[PDB]
Write an enzyme that holds these catalytic residues in place. Structure first.
Site, PDB file in Angstrom:
ATOM      1  N   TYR A 142     -47.222   9.097 -35.043  1.00 16.42           N
ATOM      2  CA  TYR A 142     -46.842   7.727 -34.788  1.00 16.42           C
ATOM      3  C   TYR A 142     -47.984   6.831 -35.032  1.00 16.42           C
ATOM      4  O   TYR A 142     -49.261   7.160 -34.664  1.00 16.42           O
ATOM      5  CB  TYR A 142     -46.196   7.624 -33.741  1.00 16.42           C
ATOM      6  CG  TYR A 142     -47.020   7.511 -32.492  1.00 16.42           C
ATOM      7  CD1 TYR A 142     -47.305   8.582 -31.695  1.00 16.42           C
ATOM      8  CD2 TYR A 142     -47.611   6.422 -31.811  1.00 16.42           C
ATOM      9  CE1 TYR A 142     -48.163   8.879 -30.582  1.00 16.42           C
ATOM     10  CE2 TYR A 142     -48.367   6.492 -30.985  1.00 16.42           C
ATOM     11  CZ  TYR A 142     -48.703   7.760 -30.087  1.00 16.42           C
ATOM     12  OH  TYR A 142     -49.713   7.828 -29.004  1.00 16.42           O
ATOM     13  N   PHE A 171     -52.343  -0.804 -31.383  1.00 22.34           N
ATOM     14  CA  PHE A 171     -52.952  -0.354 -30.179  1.00 22.34           C
ATOM     15  C   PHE A 171     -53.084   1.012 -30.028  1.00 22.34           C
ATOM     16  O   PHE A 171     -53.323   1.759 -28.983  1.00 22.34           O
ATOM     17  CB  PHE A 171     -51.926  -0.943 -29.016  1.00 22.34           C
ATOM     18  CG  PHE A 171     -50.574  -0.357 -28.836  1.00 22.34           C
ATOM     19  CD1 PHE A 171     -49.628  -0.835 -29.711  1.00 22.34           C
ATOM     20  CD2 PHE A 171     -50.277   0.560 -28.169  1.00 22.34           C
ATOM     21  CE1 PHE A 171     -48.341  -0.411 -29.723  1.00 22.34           C
ATOM     22  CE2 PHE A 171     -49.004   1.146 -28.084  1.00 22.34           C
ATOM     23  CZ  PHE A 171     -48.007   0.716 -28.654  1.00 22.34           C
ATOM     24  N   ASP A 172     -52.273   2.010 -30.982  1.00 25.39           N
ATOM     25  CA  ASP A 172     -52.065   3.296 -31.152  1.00 25.39           C
ATOM     26  C   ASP A 172     -51.805   3.803 -32.467  1.00 25.39           C
ATOM     27  O   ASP A 172     -51.557   3.197 -33.275  1.00 25.39           O
ATOM     28  CB  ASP A 172     -50.633   3.750 -30.261  1.00 25.39           C
ATOM     29  CG  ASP A 172     -50.970   4.444 -29.007  1.00 25.39           C
ATOM     30  OD1 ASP A 172     -52.070   5.038 -28.883  1.00 25.39           O
ATOM     31  OD2 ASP A 172     -50.068   4.387 -28.042  1.00 25.39           O
ATOM     32  N   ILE A 216     -41.609   6.562 -24.059  1.00 20.55           N
ATOM     33  CA  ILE A 216     -40.691   5.163 -23.717  1.00 20.55           C
ATOM     34  C   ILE A 216     -39.333   5.512 -24.425  1.00 20.55           C
ATOM     35  O   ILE A 216     -39.096   6.113 -25.419  1.00 20.55           O
ATOM     36  CB  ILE A 216     -41.403   3.928 -24.284  1.00 20.55           C
ATOM     37  CG1 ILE A 216     -41.112   2.783 -23.465  1.00 20.55           C
ATOM     38  CG2 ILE A 216     -41.248   3.788 -26.035  1.00 20.55           C
ATOM     39  CD1 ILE A 216     -41.502   2.870 -21.931  1.00 20.55           C
ATOM     40  N   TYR A 222     -42.383  -0.862 -22.302  1.00 18.23           N
ATOM     41  CA  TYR A 222     -42.824  -0.951 -21.123  1.00 18.23           C
ATOM     42  C   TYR A 222     -42.013  -1.987 -20.165  1.00 18.23           C
ATOM     43  O   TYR A 222     -41.467  -1.857 -19.103  1.00 18.23           O
ATOM     44  CB  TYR A 222     -44.366  -0.875 -20.859  1.00 18.23           C
ATOM     45  CG  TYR A 222     -44.910   0.389 -21.347  1.00 18.23           C
ATOM     46  CD1 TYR A 222     -45.603   1.328 -20.218  1.00 18.23           C
ATOM     47  CD2 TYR A 222     -45.336   0.650 -22.724  1.00 18.23           C
ATOM     48  CE1 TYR A 222     -45.782   2.440 -20.912  1.00 18.23           C
ATOM     49  CE2 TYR A 222     -45.943   1.605 -23.072  1.00 18.23           C
ATOM     50  CZ  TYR A 222     -46.137   2.931 -21.822  1.00 18.23           C
ATOM     51  OH  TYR A 222     -46.723   3.853 -22.539  1.00 18.23           O
ATOM     52  N   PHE A 260     -43.397   0.384 -34.503  1.00 20.62           N
ATOM     53  CA  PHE A 260     -44.021   1.815 -34.636  1.00 20.62           C
ATOM     54  C   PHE A 260     -43.924   2.454 -36.254  1.00 20.62           C
ATOM     55  O   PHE A 260     -42.716   2.296 -36.581  1.00 20.62           O
ATOM     56  CB  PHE A 260     -43.360   2.764 -33.827  1.00 20.62           C
ATOM     57  CG  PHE A 260     -43.703   2.444 -32.346  1.00 20.62           C
ATOM     58  CD1 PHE A 260     -42.928   1.577 -31.627  1.00 20.62           C
ATOM     59  CD2 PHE A 260     -44.685   2.994 -31.583  1.00 20.62           C
ATOM     60  CE1 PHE A 260     -43.140   1.428 -30.140  1.00 20.62           C
ATOM     61  CE2 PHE A 260     -44.791   2.835 -30.292  1.00 20.62           C
ATOM     62  CZ  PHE A 260     -44.166   2.086 -29.543  1.00 20.62           C
TER      63      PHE A 260
END
Lengths: 567, 378, 107, 325, 48, 92
Positions: free
Chosen positions: C26, C36-37, C56, C82, C99
């Site tokens: 991902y 952020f990822d 999540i 979140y 994503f």
């Protein structure tokens, strides 16, 4: 780091040789002992060898076996020459590895030439650099003394315990890693969890010396010192964290006598911080001090006069005023804090009476500090307006009877008055001098008895002993009311002054024996005989009364049985 | 219990302890002189930077400068540093090796003079590199607090000042008068105040504890060996008055008057009457100890050794006083005349006479009487 | 709450059902285009057991939503993300997550 | 004993020999250095200190007596019983109430009375030139800065409008130059100096900073900043104090802020005194006037005092990040 | 005044008994006073 | 890369990935708890394979097998899409 790895290698191989050589020593000593028993009708020299090899301290006999360091004393050792040659050879190898004995041919030579050439080349102006390079020089020139410093922290363990020491070291690492963090709720919770895991570890009691060498007692002392340090301002922060503190420290002292000695080395801090520790429901630093001083005459005689003066002055202060926390909760204002002084009296009892013998050296100092400040004794025993034990205790019964004074309950002040005075009389009769000292007629012993008899008369002792004590009464529908047992009068209070009455003012005449027998003794055993009924047999009052009788009343009768002739 | 039933790991732990005590600790090593000589050599700098006549400090000089810097650093107290403690021991051994010598025929004049020159050179290798200033700075930094720092610093000061060399004495005097620091002398005064005396109550407690049998954790020992609680800091107080004696040795009237009066400094501390005060305190303690032992004509071995260490301290204090007044310094002589020295020596005469007869009656106390007479001749 | 945006189709027949490990690369990107990822920087595919509740919820659904070798865009709304507290120092509270999911393999 | 409040100037009543060794029984005036007052006897308050205007030769005249007997002084001896010259009254202790002296009132009232107590003698010890100079500038700076405070308060709430303020003009040039002198006086020792010299001058600066902080120059600078920060801009300050006084308002604000910084630098006690003023500096971080100055003051407080980091709050951190924003 | 110092005249002293271990005290409880050995202390001028 | 940024990124990697682990290992480095294992028994002071002067030739610092007990380093993979978790102490 490289030189520290070298030191690690030296320590590890010393442990290796320890295993290899102690196997040989153990087998050879067993064979020698077996052969010396096989020798029938052992002579005097054979008996000396037998008491050296057997029925001797393990440390003493292992030193006697290793004592062949010098050739002059090599004759005293009974080990074989071939066996001792192994230790001699490994000692030579250890000296070689420590460097005792153009281009450098070792880490030691490399570091030495490096640092000398560096400081010869330039005036290094970085103080950290100077300190590091000269520390390297010091360790390279004498790594043997570095081994001397390192071996106290070297502790060989059994291979089967390695997982439990893994858990122990991981929890200790968590504790040490929380040192650099300001203590918060999460850090406090993690600290309590790690302390509890250390408690539940079997190694914590199986190898007390391992924890002594690791100095985890010092680490939790650092945590506790930080905690009280902040707590000293206003209310103590995280009381549960201090609860886990002595929970570990209190137990640590009980685990071993040497652990108790190491904790008693820091007795001074516990005494000055007992002022803020007091008032907390949980184990307090004053309790650490008590655990550090209970049933160890060696350090009890090492107890110090200003250490006694601290607890005496705190007892005086608690007597002078009233508990601020009780006043905040709303209990009636009295100007008299009994629960504060109770715990200091408890510590004084443990400081004086050990192993069934009251220490004269500490008892005299304790009573002197008690008498220079009559404020320690509270509103009762006061120079003027002190009434007496009878008035104080009976008035306390009236205080506990009505909710106007008893009510503001976790702590009942009506019971607090009685408990403080019971502990005070216990401490006095517990500081009282010894029977053999009295028979020797020692002047100081007679004077101490005279002071105690001046402070507490026989009338107050007997009258409170004969004071009515409410029994569990069976009301309607089989609804018995067992005494509160923490808010009302308990024979535990009578037991302390019975101990007083037998230690000083002891039974000398038959008439007074009977006097006290029909006043507060015979009603007590008759009440217990009535309490023996099965409905009241498991009663908490019944159990407390049986303990009071069998520990205070009945031994007095056993030791005063000869006086009963001609009754 | 015999070692055959002991668990192997416990036996290895005990073997570690026994090896530590009886083999490697008893084995002694000598690296101090070699290491200090290696630090003192400047190497090839005299060929690498010939252009500059004044060169960088040699490694030993940089070491002493680092210690002096940490001494002068602003602090509320002095902290423990194994580095400084170990280096103080190393330099002390290096410069007092000649004093220590590292039926017999007497030393010839040439032999003893050569030994004195070796001692002077070993002491020069340290006081030309700021050790005389460093020890004063450390004593000032201790601020009257006893401990390993003041112990090691005092031993180092003695090792530099052995023989009362005028060079080191003058350098210390110059540093003290230049800085006008009252901290050094205030620290010294607090050190004589913290020096202890014979504690008779501690003697009784120690005797009762010694008579008591006990058991230690590992194995079983009838009485665990511990330091005597009576006449503690004996080495420290003997060392302190030895260091003061070395300061006033050689009849240097400048130090002899500077101890009594601090003319340049704002605060004046009379170290002479501080020594008299400690001497009177020790006199009272010895008087109490004798008076307790007066009834028991036979003195126990513990009492004998306690008396011996007490009179060794008294001997060192008396030698310090002689040095204070050994030269005809009218100031120190007048101050001792006006102090309580006479009362203290009256008490000493009383204790001396009673020890003299009482120890003469018993034949086993002849060595104690001999060392007593040595103290009396002092 | 969650929508799958096909970037590159895969095979379209084998979809990860309940009971197996899901292996994914991902690239978590924020609401704001601020990444952020990602897993390819760690050079490690994110292997997680499906249905065991360790991603999540939005990512968990988007993963069952697709098939092998099938690159897709998992839009995780804060409700399935979140949400109220976010991730401390990583994702701000009440943010949409978006994503670049890539199901490279299954075991 | 190390504070400027215990500094007394001893000057004779006679000007010709106002610089010679004081004689026994000589009528001499005793003055407080920091407050500028004079030790005097008033019938309503006993022994007090009064202004120089009310100081008279019949009230402030004190002489040093060898002994309490009825019918030259040196440091280190000659304990002198201070006695009034106009009257026979002796400088003597007044025993405070036992309750107060138990609470910790070790100070006892100074009265003039023929008590004859053996401890009524006094010990004279000269202070250092550093402390003398420091106390003198503390007196002058306190006077000037309270004059500035009262000048700023005179027109507070009074829009001057047509014409300048009717009161006396602010001592702006004196205040600015005094601030510059104080910054130069608390300027930290240079790093190029040697180690021992640098630490000796650091100790000297430490005690000077502690002296000013204890006598209250820190609070007086706080008062000046509070009085100046009522006005948002130089024009708004002109609307009350005048354009002729408005040009230098920014400069005085910057100078006060850097003086605050120079007072608190390297002083743990001075930064811990600012624990209650952490909100005071946080709410003023947004000020455009000496933004760097107020940020520097906050920086010094945070780097020196570890206490203030325990009372740092989320709003405080949001203000510090709003500084970046 | 320290332990072991000589007793100058006019100095305030405290006189504790050896047997009773009680400092001499001035009761002052009643209108007329009393001297008595008590655990409290009272100052005595020791005037020759 | 500019030098200040090089040092900053190096120390950032050390601070976020290695700092707590190295601090914990350093705190363990003081004590030497040697298990009584056959590997410990095989640990020789001088190189066991070499003999005589070859044995006296010191081995390199750290190549030899060390058995003294050290708590193993524990790390948690950095994941910020997992389900949101009194909580156990977060790993490096």
């Amino acid at each position: 780091y490289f030189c520290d790895q070298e030191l690690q290698h030296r320590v590890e191989s010393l442990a290796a040789f320890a295993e290899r050589y102690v196997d040989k020593l153990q087998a050879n000593q067993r064979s020698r002992y077996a052969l010396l028993m096989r020798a029938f009708t052992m002579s005097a020299a054979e008996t000396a060898r037998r008491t050296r090899e057997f029925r001797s301290p393990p440390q003493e006999q292992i030193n006697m076996l290793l004592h062949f360091k010098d050739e002059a004393d090599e004759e005293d050792c009974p080990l074989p020459e071939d066996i001792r040659q192994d230790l001699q050879d490994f000692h030579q190898d250890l000296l070689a590895h420590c460097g005792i004995q153009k281009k450098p041919q070792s880490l030691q030579e490399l570091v030495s030439h490096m640092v000398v050439r560096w400081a010869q080349e330039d005036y290094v102006q970085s103080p950290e650099l100077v300190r590091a390079m000269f520390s390297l020089l010091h360790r390279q020139y004498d790594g043997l003394g570095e081994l001397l410093r390192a071996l106290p922290r070297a502790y060989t363990i059994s291979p089967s315990s390695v997982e439990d020491t893994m858990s122990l070291l991981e929890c200790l690492g968590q504790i040490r890693s929380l040192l650099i963090v300001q203590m918060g709720p999460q850090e406090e919770n993690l600290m309590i969890q790690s302390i509890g895991n250390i408690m539940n570890n079997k190694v914590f009691y199986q190898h007390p010396n391992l924890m002594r060498a690791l100095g985890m007692h010092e680490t939790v002392m650092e945590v506790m010192v930080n905690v009280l340090g902040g707590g000293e301002t206003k209310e103590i922060r995280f009381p549960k964290m201090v609860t886990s503190c002595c929970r570990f420290l209190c137990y640590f002292c009980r685990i071993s006598r040497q652990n108790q000695r190491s904790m008693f080395d820091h007795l001074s801090y516990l005494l000055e911080n007992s002022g803020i520790g007091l008032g907390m429901q949980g184990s307090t630093p004053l309790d650490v001090a008590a655990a550090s001083v209970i049933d160890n005459n060696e350090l009890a005689l090492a107890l110090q006069e200003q250490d006694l003066e601290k607890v005496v002055s705190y007892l005086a202060g608690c007597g002078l005023q009233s508990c601020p926390m009780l006043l905040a909760k709303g209990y009636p204002d009295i100007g008299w804090n009994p629960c504060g002084g109770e715990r200091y009296l408890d510590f004084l009892r443990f400081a004086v009476f050990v192993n069934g013998e009251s220490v004269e050296e500490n008892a005299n100092v304790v009573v002197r500090l008690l008498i220079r400040k009559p404020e320690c004794f509270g509103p009762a025993l006061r120079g003027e307006g002190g009434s007496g034990l009878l008035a104080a205790i009976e008035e306390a019964i009236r205080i506990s009877e009505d909710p106007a004074r008893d009510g503001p309950n976790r702590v009942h002040l009506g019971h607090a008055i009685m408990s403080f005075y019971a502990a005070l009389i216990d401490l006095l009769g517990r500081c009282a001098p010894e029977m053999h000292l009295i028979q020797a007629g020692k002047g100081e012993a007679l004077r101490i008895r005279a002071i105690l008899r001046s402070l507490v008369p026989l009338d107050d002792l007997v009258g409170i002993i004969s004071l009515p004590l409410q029994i569990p009464t069976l009301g309607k529908d089989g609804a018995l009311v067992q005494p509160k047992m923490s808010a009302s009068f308990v024979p535990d209070h009578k037991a302390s002054m019975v101990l007083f009455l037998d230690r000083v003012y002891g039974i000398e005449n038959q008439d007074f024996l009977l006097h006290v027998l029909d006043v507060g003794f015979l009603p007590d055993m008759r009440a217990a005989a009535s309490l023996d009924t099965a409905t009241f047999s498991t009663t908490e009052m019944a159990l407390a009364l049986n303990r009071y009788l069998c520990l205070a009343v009945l031994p007095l009768i056993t030791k005063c049985a000869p006086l009963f002739a001609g009754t | 219990t015999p070692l055959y039933n002991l668990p192997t790991h416990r036996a290895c732990n005990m073997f570690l302890e026994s090896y530590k005590a009886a083999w490697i600790l008893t084995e002694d090593h000598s690296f101090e002189d070699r290491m200090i000589d290696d630090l003192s050599k400047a190497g090839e700098q005299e060929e690498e930077e010939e252009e500059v006549e004044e060169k960088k400090p040699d490694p030993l000089h940089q070491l002493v400068l680092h210690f002096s810097r940490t001494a002068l650093t602003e602090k509320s107290k002095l902290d423990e540093d194994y580095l400084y403690m170990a280096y103080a021991d190393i330099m002390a051994k290096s410069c007092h090796l000649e004093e220590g010598g590292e039926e017999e025929v007497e030393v010839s004049f040439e032999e003893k003079e050569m030994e004195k020159q070796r001692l002077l050179y070993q002491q020069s290798r340290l006081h030309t590199r700021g050790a005389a200033e460093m020890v004063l700075q450390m004593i000032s930094a201790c601020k009257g607090e006893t401990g390993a720092m003041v112990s090691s610093t005092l031993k180092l000061g003695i090792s530099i000042l052995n023989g009362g060399n005028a060079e080191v004495q003058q350098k210390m005097l110059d540093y003290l008068k230049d800085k006008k620091e009252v901290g050094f002398f205030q620290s010294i005064q607090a050190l004589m105040q913290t020096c202890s005396v014979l504690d008779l109550n501690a003697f009784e407690r120690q005797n009762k504890a010694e008579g008591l049998g006990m058991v230690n954790e590992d194995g079983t020992v009838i009485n665990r060996q511990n330091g005597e609680k009576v006449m503690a800091d004996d080495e420290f107080t003997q060392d302190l008055f030895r260091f003061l004696q070395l300061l006033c040795e050689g009849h240097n009237n400048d130090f002899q008057n500077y101890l009594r009066t601090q003319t340049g400094n704002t605060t004046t501390i009379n170290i002479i009457i501080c020594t008299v005060d400690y001497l009177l305190r020790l006199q009272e303690s010895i008087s109490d100890f004798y008076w307790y032992y007066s009834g028991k004509d036979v003195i126990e071995e513990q009492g004998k050794r306690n008396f011996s260490k007490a009179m060794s301290v008294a001997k060192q204090v008396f030698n310090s006083l002689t040095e204070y007044i050994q030269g005809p310094c009218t100031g120190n002589q007048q101050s001792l005349a006006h102090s309580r020295l006479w009362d203290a020596v009256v008490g000493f005469l009383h204790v001396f006479a009673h020890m003299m007869m009482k120890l003469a009656q018993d034949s086993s106390q002849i060595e104690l009487l001999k060392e007593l007479l040595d103290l009396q001749k002092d | 709450g969650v929508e799958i945006e096909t970037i590159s189709p895969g095979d379209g027949r084998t979809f990860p059902k309940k009971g197996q490990t899901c292996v994914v690369h991902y690239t978590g990107m924020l609401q704001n285009g601020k990444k952020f990822d990602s897993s390819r920087d760690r050079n490690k595919p994110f292997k997680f057991r499906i249905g065991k509740q360790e991603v999540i919820k939005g990512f968990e659904e988007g993963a069952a939503q697709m098939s092998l070798g099938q690159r897709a865009k998992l839009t995780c709304t804060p409700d399935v993300a979140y949400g109220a507290t976010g991730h401390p120092g990583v994702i701000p509270p009440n943010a949409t997550l978006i994503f670049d999911v890539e199901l490279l393999n299954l075991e | 004993c190390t504070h400027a409040r215990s500094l007394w100037r001893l000057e004779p009543l006679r000007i010709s020999w106002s610089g010679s060794h004081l004689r026994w029984g000589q009528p001499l005036r005793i003055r407080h250095v920091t407050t500028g007052r004079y030790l005097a006897l008033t019938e309503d308050q006993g022994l007090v200190v009064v202004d120089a205007c009310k100081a008279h030769t019949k009230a402030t005249s004190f002489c040093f007596r060898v002994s309490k007997e009825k019918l030259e002084i040196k440091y280190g001896e000659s304990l002198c019983f201070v006695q009034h010259v106009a009257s026979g009254l002796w400088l003597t202790y007044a025993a405070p109430d036992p309750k107060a002296l138990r609470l910790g009132v070790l100070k006892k009232k100074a009265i003039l009375h023929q008590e004859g107590h053996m401890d009524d003698a006094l010990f004279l010890t000269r202070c250092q030139q550093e402390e003398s100079q420091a106390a003198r500038m503390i007196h002058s700076t306190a006077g000037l800065y309270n004059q500035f405070i009262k000048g700023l308060d005179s027109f507070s709430g009074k829009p001057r409008g047509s014409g300048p303020p009717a009161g006396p003009a602010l001592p702006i040039e004196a205040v600015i130059l005094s601030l510059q002198d104080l910054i130069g006086y608390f300027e930290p020792p240079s790093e190029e100096l040697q180690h021992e010299e640098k630490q000796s001058k650091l100790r000297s600066l430490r005690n000077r900073q502690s002296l000013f902080q204890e006598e209250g120059m820190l609070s007086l600078v706080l008062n000046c900043i509070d009085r100046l920060n009522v006005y948002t801009t130089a024009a708004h300050f002109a609307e009350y104090a005048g354009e002729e006084a408005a040009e230098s308002w920014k400069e005085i604000v910057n100078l006060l802020y850097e003086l605050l910084a120079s007072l608190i630098r390297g002083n743990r006690a001075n930064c811990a005194l600012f624990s209650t003023n952490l909100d005071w500096v946080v709410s003023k971080l947004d000020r455009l006037e000496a933004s760097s100055g107020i940020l520097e003051v906050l920086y010094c407080v945070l780097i020196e005092s570890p206490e203030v980091l325990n009372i740092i709050q989320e709003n405080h951190i949001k203000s510090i990040i709003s500084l970046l924003d | 005044r320290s332990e072991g110092e000589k007793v100058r005249v006019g100095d305030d002293l405290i006189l504790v008994s050896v047997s009773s271990e009680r400092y001499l005290h001035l009761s002052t409880a009643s209108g007329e006073l009393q001297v008595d050995a008590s655990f409290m202390q009272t100052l005595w001028n020791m005037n020759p | 890369l500019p030098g200040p940024l090089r040092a900053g990124y190096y120390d950032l990697l050390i601070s976020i990935h290695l700092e707590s682990a190295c601090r914990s290992r350093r705190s363990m480095l003081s004590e030497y708890i040697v298990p009584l294992t056959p590997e410990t028994r095989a640990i020789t002071l001088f190189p066991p394979g070499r003999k005589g002067g070859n044995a006296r030739r010191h081995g390199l610092p750290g190549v030899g097998v060390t058995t003294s007990l050290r708590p193993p380093h524990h790390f948690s993979p950095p994941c910020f899409v997992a389900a949101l978790p009194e909580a156990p102490a977060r790993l490096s």
